[PDB]
């Protein structure tokens, strides 16, 4: 049920930084557990990850600096709703 | 000695407790245009760059919003978040963490109505549209720029976001800003246009100097100021209520639609923003196109506190199967059926208090809203095979009348049968609630409302407009 | 129009 998304304007993509978005009803301590669970299993595979920020107040989730290789692993984490690659915004 | 843009948003008749957040570059907060009125939060989330240039974009825009001499809403309080770096560049993640900071600021030290200006754009983002949406259902007014790419604004964020006012730009001759392959964005995701070319504002070169800049964020800046003044005269306004007033008080039918691609001219509203001088409000909503199947439905929907009084459809082809009003999630919704090139669903979304509305689906001298005191606000019509005030007329077709119980509401039905395009408009003071086509000697491909004008397109055709007032 | 958004306008 959890899906991945990334910007279509290809030169605006920002690979390596991902916005993990959990389901509506997820609590902040659940979101932090889920985010550290990612680093836990990514460390087992010899990948280093950095949780840059954990969200709460508008949407539940977190922002992780990691390889895209871990995207199958991250999609299967509990509570995960969708993941989106970070991308560039510009002054208008 | 009055800048063209400030005169344009002045109505033809004309006679604080709101805060305005701004997310972009750094700001020269001690510029005499904006000095004292602009608290720099010093929040910062900007990517690494791959000094007077750093704050040029945001200084100008804070000046357009509240500058002392060249601002729209002088005396508006502003707070500044840095999300774009010195090259005008930012990230979606930076903008989420920024929007999140605003909401948590508002929970920790509440104030009056909030107007967040988003003078930025990237490609369509699921996550950024969700955040603007959930911030808007919390009660915060978000105003955004349509985009600078002469494109469909639905392909960009937060321009395409649900529940954000998206603003495109126009210049001093009431035409869309276009510059080669660059220019204002357009389409069903643009709510209105505002002055955005040759806009004079505070220049980050000196504390006293001015510059002229262009952009859909300059257009957005006029509207954030118009909304800031609007929200101080009436702080209780919901966002549905504000957007209806923004549309109502705009200048209508001044833009030269020939500057837009042919297929986007119906989808793009011909509105140029204006302040209120010193009622039944309706706006037309266009659907995300359905598809090329013969079993194909597109859906246009109204705001949560917005009633749906009519529903129609438009097929560029002609081969259409009509439209119908259906309840979904507890809300009236408009759904258009394809035969088939594809179809749009054109909903008429109105703001009516003290009114219960209901759909009555029956064949076509019968009356559909026979309940005494109820008004007929709009008539829909759909069929399966391809071959008198409170009454809907048809041909083999199933009718979907929408009938509201409303005390002050008064409704009259104007018609006009005649060719490519037939029009009939409600008289001044009435609001068009429903627009429908009556068939005849010509196949009709669609009927849609344009402010208070009912427009039916055919290839004998009768336009049928339902107009309502208060008393 | 300006680079922060250098051609002229009107
Ligand atoms: Ca919009």
Write the layout of secondary structure elements.
The complex is a heterotrimer of chains A (92), B (471) and C (10).
Chain A: E1 3-5, E2 13-22, H1 28-44, E3 50-55, E4 61-65, H2 71-75, E5 80-91
Parallel strand pairs in A: 1-5
Antiparallel strand pairs in A: 2-4, 2-5, 3-4
Chain B: H1 4-8, E1 19-24, E2 38-44, H2 56-66, E3 77-82, E4 89-91, H3 92-108, E5 114-118, E6 120-123, H4 126-136, E7 141-145, E8 156-157, E9 165-170, E10 178-179, E11 182-183, E12 192-195, E13 199-202, E14 210-213, H5 216-233, H6 239-248, E15 251-252, E16 271-272, E17 281-286, E18 297-300, E19 307-314, E20 320-328, E21 331-338, E22 344-351, E23 356-362, E24 374-382, E25 398-405, E26 410-417, E27 421-425, E28 431-438, E29 444-450, E30 453-458, E31 462-469
Parallel strand pairs in B: 1-3, 1-5, 2-3, 5-7, 7-9, 9-12
Antiparallel strand pairs in B: 6-8, 10-11, 13-14, 15-16, 17-22, 18-21, 19-22, 20-21, 23-25, 24-25, 26-31, 27-30, 28-31, 29-30
Helix pairs in contact in B: 2-5, 3-4
Chain C: no helix or strand
Can you give a write-up of this model?
The complex is a heterotrimer of chains A (92), B (471) and C (10). With 92 residues, chain A is α+β, with helices and mostly antiparallel strands. Chain A has helices at residues 28-44, 71-75; strands at residues 3-5, 13-22, 50-55, 61-65, 80-91. Chain A has a five-stranded mixed beta sheet with strand order 1-5-2-4-3. In chain A, a hairpin with a 5-residue loop joins β3 and β4 (61-65). The longest helix of chain A has 17 residues, at 28-44. Chain A is globular. Chain B is built from six helices and 31 strands. In chain B, α3 runs parallel beside α4 (126-136). The longest helix of chain B is centred in the middle third of the chain and has 18 residues, at 216-233. Chain C is largely without helices or strands. The relative contact order of chain C is 0.50. Classes of the chains: A alpha+beta (92), B alpha+beta (471), C little secondary structure (10). The interface between A and B is medium-sized, with 26 and 43 residues. Bound molecules: calcium ion. Calcium ion binds at residues 164, 166, 189, 191 of chain B. The site of calcium ion (CA) has 4 residues of chain B, from loops.
